[PDB]
Design a protein around this ligand. Structure first.
Ligand SMILES: CC(C)S[C@@H]1O[C@H](CO)[C@H](O)[C@H](O)[C@H]1O
Ligand SMILES: CC(C)S[C@@H]1O[C@H](CO)[C@H](O)[C@H](O)[C@H]1O
Ligand SMILES: CC(C)S[C@@H]1O[C@H](CO)[C@H](O)[C@H](O)[C@H]1O
Ligand SMILES: CC(C)S[C@@H]1O[C@H](CO)[C@H](O)[C@H](O)[C@H]1O
Lengths: 296, 296, 296, 296
């Protein structure tokens, strides 16, 4: 009983909250989990990661890493005879896998904003060289389409807070001031939020943001982020588990999806990028002047 | 060579970021790394990961886990005839250790705080279990004192955003309102922030905050966290290198302290009991500008 | 396969960008390119180049050089067998050409200034030797009368920046001061901008300028300029596709016009005469805010 | 006597100004210049570029493309017997090549600021995968270090007018505010120049920028660039000329250096006007608030 976990960059919270979640279930079942982090590169990076664990004489493999249909299949055979469960793959590729409904994920985000009266929605996607990053972009460009609305913007980030921050100062330094944004994860929305703020914009009221994952700090990110949840606590549960099932005789086989949901919090409101004021705002500015000349 | 790591919960940013770095360095030297995850509960928890990692015939062992003066010893003996490096222990311990200066980290934090005219300072510590936690709490006590200052409050967290949040919300609600707050880590600092905001107070202008760590996301928090940088990257390469040196008997024995540095950003600023509309005001004309434009 | 391109001066931005574009499209289908630098000398030069690329045994020729009707007719005669494709000609020439709608491109530019309330409009053309420049000056002329205006000034640059400069500040020196200037290409607009500024006016607020091309750097001229966007990347791609199929029996033939668009930015504003409030304020308020967050 | 020219991206101004000269020169001797291109791949891309040209019976080969010491050496062999002149290389890579003085170009930048009284300078370097950019970063260090100063920042761009904008949005938003920047190319200066302005700073008077290359548009940028002139005409010339000489048995086989210069203009002043953020700011916020006041 020695579960091998070939995971992402543990810098990112998700691949981390997942491992914690894994190590946690293997705990009660009474099995041992052993991590092997895997490089930024791809396919072959993952392969060696795989080989290591194979050497430790692991029992089965949970591959938490981005792979294209083709790559996934490669890696599977790399494992030779050990049963390997895949966590970040197309919900189409043959291999055994557990995926969060990328279809429901986007559908919810999209429809929540539309109902809220938003029309000018901008998209901040993850690193398009990542299947999961790719499948949410798709679902965005579908559920907004079926709703008739079209994305006034589209950026590419990389799962970091800074990435979401730059791509949002960029988008705003050239004229696209929307009323809502669909971000590919919670860290990018964190940065995205500071962005929208250092710009005189009220997050939520002026620009509604909706993260995606609902990692831990998301509750405390200033406006407690309205985010789509991915229960990794329960993803590891089902994972370690099914992994046992495949090895110890049977299985279930191939694609198996889990649900997601809209954790409605505080970054999403009626469009109204604020309307009105006569010379009320003139009277406002007026005082700051006193204040400023109150200084020099 | 094969490096083994006993680690705290991979879900805490700092530990995840310290694990990720140790990775990079093993990578540059053609060495594999395997991580055993531990349940921050006790010394036994620790002896296990070690004990299983010592079954992998790992070449070096790195124990990044909060062991006590006497526990460390139990664990060093546990990691039989293999060199181990302890990362969360005390320089006050006869084990091969590499740690960050707690004496400076706390020194600066106070030094910076008193330097801006703050006198009523509140302390928000981490789980008093962590040697480190307790260490950081010793320092703040030492330096506030050398500045004839005694803290007006001292709550305790558990290293997470939500504890930083629950704790200040309680303090604040208790009539206790500081003018500057010293937090044990960036994460809890996120929480304290949100609380300080929901209390209707300008974080920076009214209550200045100083985390301690400079984990990734901090450059993107609300007003970016003025915070004690612990160079996890630095910590990474050293341990890895020294672990080889270690196997080869190269007596890089005993303790050795890495430095911290105060990163200035947007949460520290003088006590708002001086001038009014400091820094902020600027980014108030910004809001107003962004309202007037909305009307044309 | 192997395409040849007889080009205008490579030192002129748009033609360079078009070549770079054509290069990519070639690459996409694995077509080899080869460029011949044509001297502004004239059709006897653009003829030699045609003859030189024929020496190489090109499969198809793209000719982006500003030839005149009979000058175009004369060069195709020289395109023995190999199919030539003309980029700089008039839709009116009975050869195979692909160009950008000089109609809409001059239409919008005018409509944009008329709808902004301008009326004293000055024109800055390119060298009247070229069809394209003259094609552009014809439009401006048509729409201004059709919108009951007649340019108050009409100068002639040569596509370079310095022309835009000299020419404008020259007109400015004769005391001919307009509220809007239409310029034949971005480069010249860069220059005009400096002349304007250098002679004491706020480009935009006082004299507004439109461009034509939206070449690379345009996003960065201090006030980024509103300009007629011509997609050279599209041009480049079609050029090849057409040339291929064309040259490959599948006779396309004739002339096809590509669409353009008005890229709105910071140089086009309402006339200063009317309140100087077109905007001013939102743009102003905001950067004053940044100097208000610089002394505290 | 046919000269094959394997050039870089022609999107950039310098490689295009050099081709223009390359032809302009070859034009005088009664020689043909056939331009071939390379993407940003490296060696293989530069080699195909070379095999292509070899096909057309080119008698010369001018490689104006970034090659690493041993990569140059490969492409030379690739180049075969047909004599090759390299334009982008290091003075100590063993082949016949003409390069501007990276040593004096950086020396002049440095000494100019130092003597002007600049202490805090930032470094906007070019893509560190381009020898030009590298020897040019190193050079600046040497002279600054020689002068007792160290870069308060060091960013990396990619030669476009936009990377200049983002790295100055960046380096500035993250608090660094130098008083001089040594930019590694004139296009990247239009962005820094534009960034430094949109942040309430006066280029020249507040941040002092100094570009590199001095290309055609630089004398028309807003405050016209104090730049380092690389005489692209003298280079085109010396290039072709020397090219027919080695072709014709002669030599001086290996390194050859041309001079650089400092074209002083208006982006460099003595550090400070004292206050870009003073009293007026409130009086000015007033008339604004009042210019506001009336659109309601
Ligand atoms: C593992 C990274 C690609 S990041 C990570 O993966 C998770 C599970 O796939 C979720 O996708 C998160 O949104 C994303 O941040
Ligand atoms: C596992 C916790 C002690 S968290 C973590 O560990 C790091 C390494 O020592 C530092 O202690 C960080 O402050 C702390 O946040
Ligand atoms: C062919 C150049 C002399 S000019 C160049 O060409 C483009 C494509 O035709 C456009 O005509 C540009 O405005 C002009 O600068
Ligand atoms: C092709 C690029 C390196 S751009 C270009 O190259 C010339 C080569 O000498 C110069 O070095 C310029 O500084 C740079 O912008």
């Amino acid at each position: 009983l020695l579960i091998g976990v070939a995971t992402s960059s543990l810098a990112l919270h998700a691949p981390s909250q997942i491992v914690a979640a894994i190590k946690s279930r293997a705990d009660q079942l009474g099995a041992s989990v052993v991590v092997s982090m895997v490089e930024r590169s791809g396919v072959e990076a993952c392969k060696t990661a795989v080989h290591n664990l194979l050497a430790q004489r692991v029992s089965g493999l949970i591959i938490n890493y981005p792979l294209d249909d083709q790559d996934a299949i490669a890696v599977e055979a790399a494992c030779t005879n050990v049963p390997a469960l895949f966590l970040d793959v197309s919900d189409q590729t043959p291999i055994n896998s557990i995926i969060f409904s990328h279809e429901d994920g986007t559908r919810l985000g999209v429809e929540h904003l539309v109902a809220l009266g938003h029309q000018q929605i901008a998209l901040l996607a993850g690193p398009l060289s990542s299947v999961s990053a790719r499948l949410r972009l798709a679902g965005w460009h579908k559920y907004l389409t079926r709703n008739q609305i079209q994305p006034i913007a589209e950026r590419e980030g990389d799962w970091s807070a800074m990435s979401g921050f730059q791509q949002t100062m960029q988008m705003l330094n050239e004229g696209i001031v929307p009323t809502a944004m669909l971000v590919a994860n919670d860290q990018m929305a964190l940065g995205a939020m500071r962005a929208i703020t250092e710009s005189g914009l009220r997050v939520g009221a002026d620009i509604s943001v909706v993260g995606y994952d609902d990692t831990e700090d998301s509750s405390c990110y200033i406006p407690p982020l309205t985010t789509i949840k991915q229960d990794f606590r329960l993803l590891g549960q089902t994972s370690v588990d099914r992994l046992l099932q495949l090895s110890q005789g049977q299985a279930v086989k191939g694609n198996q999806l889990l649900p997601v949901s809209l954790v409605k919090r505080k970054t999403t409101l009626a469009p109204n990028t604020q309307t009105a004021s006569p010379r009320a705002l003139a009277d406002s500015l007026m005082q700051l002047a006193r204040q400023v000349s109150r200084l020099e």
